[PDB]
Enzyme design. Structure first.
Site, PDB file in Angstrom:
ATOM      1  CE1 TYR A  68      -4.325  -1.502   0.395  1.00  0.00           C
ATOM      2  CE2 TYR A  68      -2.999  -3.176   1.473  1.00  0.00           C
ATOM      3  CZ  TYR A  68      -4.181  -2.784   0.882  1.00  0.00           C
ATOM      4  OH  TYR A  68      -5.224  -3.676   0.772  1.00  0.00           O
TER       5      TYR A  68
HETATM    6  N1  LIG Z   1      -2.810   3.730   5.055  1.00  0.00           N
HETATM    7  C1  LIG Z   1      -3.711   3.346   4.161  1.00  0.00           C
HETATM    8  N2  LIG Z   1      -3.541   3.683   2.871  1.00  0.00           N
HETATM    9  C2  LIG Z   1      -4.454   3.277   1.985  1.00  0.00           C
HETATM   10  N3  LIG Z   1      -5.521   2.507   2.166  1.00  0.00           N
HETATM   11  C3  LIG Z   1      -5.635   2.150   3.447  1.00  0.00           C
HETATM   12  C4  LIG Z   1      -4.798   2.524   4.470  1.00  0.00           C
HETATM   13  N4  LIG Z   1      -5.225   1.978   5.659  1.00  0.00           N
HETATM   14  C5  LIG Z   1      -6.286   1.289   5.322  1.00  0.00           C
HETATM   15  N5  LIG Z   1      -6.588   1.357   4.020  1.00  0.00           N
HETATM   16  C6  LIG Z   1      -7.672   0.608   3.430  1.00  0.00           C
HETATM   17  O1  LIG Z   1      -7.241  -0.652   3.011  1.00  0.00           O
HETATM   18  C7  LIG Z   1      -8.452  -1.247   2.502  1.00  0.00           C
HETATM   19  C8  LIG Z   1      -8.306  -2.644   1.954  1.00  0.00           C
HETATM   20  O2  LIG Z   1      -9.603  -3.260   1.774  1.00  0.00           O
HETATM   21  P1  LIG Z   1      -9.703  -4.825   2.120  1.00  0.00           P
HETATM   22  O3  LIG Z   1      -9.402  -5.055   3.519  1.00  0.00           O
HETATM   23  O4  LIG Z   1     -10.948  -5.415   1.596  1.00  0.00           O
HETATM   24  O5  LIG Z   1      -8.509  -5.459   1.342  1.00  0.00           O
HETATM   25  P2  LIG Z   1      -8.558  -6.834   0.595  1.00  0.00           P
HETATM   26  O6  LIG Z   1      -9.710  -7.575   1.051  1.00  0.00           O
HETATM   27  O7  LIG Z   1      -7.252  -7.392   0.630  1.00  0.00           O
HETATM   28  O8  LIG Z   1      -8.874  -6.349  -0.864  1.00  0.00           O
HETATM   29  P3  LIG Z   1      -9.651  -7.073  -1.955  1.00  0.00           P
HETATM   30  O9  LIG Z   1     -10.834  -7.378  -1.276  1.00  0.00           O
HETATM   31  O10 LIG Z   1      -9.821  -6.143  -2.971  1.00  0.00           O
HETATM   32  O11 LIG Z   1      -8.915  -8.170  -2.338  1.00  0.00           O
HETATM   33  C9  LIG Z   1      -8.963  -0.178   1.557  1.00  0.00           C
HETATM   34  O12 LIG Z   1     -10.215  -0.848   1.600  1.00  0.00           O
HETATM   35  C10 LIG Z   1      -8.394   1.114   2.209  1.00  0.00           C
HETATM   36  O13 LIG Z   1      -9.074   2.116   2.918  1.00  0.00           O
END
Ligand SMILES: Nc1ncnc2c1ncn2[C@@H]1O[C@H](COP(=O)(O)OP(=O)(O)OP(=O)(O)O)[C@@H](O)[C@H]1O
Ligand SMILES: Nc1ncnc2c1ncn2[C@@H]1O[C@H](COP(=O)(O)OP(=O)(O)OP(=O)(O)O)[C@@H](O)[C@H]1O
Ligand SMILES: [Ca+2]
Ligand SMILES: [Ca+2]
Ligand SMILES: [Ca+2]
Ligand SMILES: [Ca+2]
Lengths: 176, 176
Positions: free
Chosen positions: A39
């Site tokens: 990220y």
């Molecule tokens: N420091 C940060 N920078 C950017 N995004 C962040 C940060 N902290 C948290 N986030 C969040 O991380 C989240 C990741 O979403 P999620 O937990 O569903 O990931 P994931 O399930 O691995 O993704 P996907 O479902 O697409 O595979 C975003 O939804 C976003 O707001």
């Protein structure tokens, strides 16, 4: 532009391996993904404050760059999502670093994907967090998704806890 | 990281079609590229002031994202270059626009690429600018490149004018 609408559950009981046996009967397994996520943050536009995200993902060697918009829902993780596949992760990271982005944190998981009538069920095992389930709907309303999740947990006798916090958030709190 | 070292010539005489006939004898044609370029700017870090560039290129349907660093030379366009191929131009543009970049200008050309002993000769026809030639060396010194270009123009009786200005720059001035 695509609209990601998902529900995330923290699994209390049973383990994912046991859930896998209960759903195996009428859920068609798709694939298993080993996902390593990087990220990034814009030093002038903290995505944590704007509720955005920029992510470079390595899933089984396939490299994907993903922007995610602000959450538009309080009962589901409703977000704008835009993805492109890139040829080289290192050079995409370099370009981003050269453009001024900084690597915020890394997330790693093993995800097992199952399908059932326009629903994508993902069994997530997160490094240093635990076991989760995500259900994502293709062109399904927020009520349709919420309703199906209720059916899914009841049919397979799952003890759970809903949350709209992201894995990255959960990982931060767990550190303290 | 790769170091792009090239020399750019504005062709005074003859036309590229005539040059193509003179080099055809001992230069092996590679391919012809129709390149449409979109350049971006960081509103807080004007690349024209830092001497950088971020470019989304469509060359014969292949989509390439390119960062270019500052010029490290005064007799050749010596620059850092980092490229990755992306799956979708529209969505890469959207991601960049969503991240805050703005589309600065567009450049279009037809480029014919020839090869000769670790040298890449490109015959460029630019929309609303004219005809140019670029010679790029693979692991060649600045003296080796400069020397070969002198031989190339003499062998094929080309009237030319060297320049380290970019096509985007030339296009801006030509407007006024
Ligand atoms: N420091 C940060 N920078 C950017 N995004 C962040 C940060 N902290 C948290 N986030 C969040 O991380 C989240 C990741 O979403 P999620 O937990 O569903 O990931 P994931 O399930 O691995 O993704 P996907 O479902 O697409 O595979 C975003 O939804 C976003 O707001
Ligand atoms: N506004 C601007 N934003 C970014 N870059 C700019 C801008 N104006 C000019 N440039 C310059 O555009 C240049 C393009 O280089 P060049 O003219 O060689 O393009 P090209 O020949 O099409 O590229 P290539 O040789 O890689 O195919 C960079 O070299 C960069 O400084
Ligand atoms: Ca998802
Ligand atoms: Ca998710
Ligand atoms: Ca070049
Ligand atoms: Ca060039």
């Amino acid at each position: 532009s695509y609209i990601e609408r998902e529900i995330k559950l923290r699994v209390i009981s049973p383990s994912l391996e046991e859930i896998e046996e209960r759903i195996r009967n009428n859920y068609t397994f798709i694939n298993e993904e080993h996902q390593i996520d990087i990220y990034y943050n814009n030093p002038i536009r903290d995505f944590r404050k704007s509720d955005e995200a920029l992510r470079l993902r390595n899933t089984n060697g396939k490299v994907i760059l993903t922007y995610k918009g602000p959450k538009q829902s309080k009962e589901t993780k409703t977000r704008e999502e835009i993805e492109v596949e890139v040829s080289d992760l290192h050079k995409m990271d370099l370009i981003l670093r050269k453009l001024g982005f900084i690597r915020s944190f890394q997330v790693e998981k093993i995800r097992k994907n199952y399908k059932y009538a326009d629903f994508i069920i993902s069994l997530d095992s997160i490094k240093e967090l635990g076991e989760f389930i995500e259900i994502e709907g293709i062109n399904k309303t927020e009520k349709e998704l919420i309703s199906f999740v209720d059916e899914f947990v009841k049919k397979h006798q799952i003890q759970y806890e809903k949350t709209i916090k992201s894995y990255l958030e959960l990982l931060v709190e767990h550190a303290k």
